[PDB]
Amino acid sequence: SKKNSLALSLTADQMVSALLDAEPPILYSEFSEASMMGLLTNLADRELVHMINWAKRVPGFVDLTLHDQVHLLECAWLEILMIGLVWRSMEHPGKLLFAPNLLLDRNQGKCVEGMVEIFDMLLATSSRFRMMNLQGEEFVCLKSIILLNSGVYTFLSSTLKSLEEKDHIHRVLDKITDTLIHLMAKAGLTLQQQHQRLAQLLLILSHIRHMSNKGMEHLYSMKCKNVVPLYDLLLEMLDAHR
C-alpha cells in the first residue's frame, strides 16, 4: 500500500489556495445548426486540453493510477465544462456565457435541434447558483468534487489496488467537504446554516450529472447526424460513454 498522499495533510485554506491556483486559462471563442454547434464544440475541445492540466493540479489526482485518472476525466468532463459554464453565466440572466465574446440567448438554442431543453436546464442551474450567492471558493470545491466523485463507483475492477484508489479518493473528497464547511464558518454561517448549504450545493451535483447525461446523448446524436465535424480529443471523450 502507498503511504498517505500529501494532499490529505493540507489545511482548509491550503486546499482552497491549491484549487484557485490550478484554475485553467480563460478562453475566447473563435448561426446555423452546424455553425452554432461548431463554436461550442470547438470551445469544448480546447477547454478539454486545459482540463487535463487543471486535473493534474487538483490535490490527490496525481496519486491515482493513470488508468483511474483516465476513467475520472472520461466520466466527468461534460459536467466539468457544464459547471464552469453555469458559473460564468450566473450574472447573465437568460443567457449562457460560453466565453467572454460568446454570450448566447435562450432562444438562440432553438437554432440547434434538441438544444433549448439543454439551455433551459443550464439556465436554471445558473439561477439556482445566483440565488445561493455561490462563491468562487465554493465553486472550485464543487468542480473538484465532480472530478473525484463521478467515476468513483464505476471503476469496474475489484482488486485491492482499486479499493486502495477509491479509499484515497473518498479521503480527498472528505478534505474538500471540510474545506467547504470552513469557508462557510469563516463567512459567519451558523452550524445549522453550514450543514444546510453543503447539502444545497451537493444536490445541485445531481442536476449537473443529469444535464451532462442529456448532453452526452445530444452530443452523440449531433455526431451521428454529421452536423459537426468533431475533433480528436472531443471525439475521443465521447466514445468513452458510448
Binding site: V49, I52, L66, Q69, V70, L233, E236
Partner: peptide, 9 residues
C-alpha cells in the same frame, strides 16, 4: 490515446 499523452505530459 490523446488523453494518455496529455496525462503523462
Amino acid at each position: 490515446k490523446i488523453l494518455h499523452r496529455l496525462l503523462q505530459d
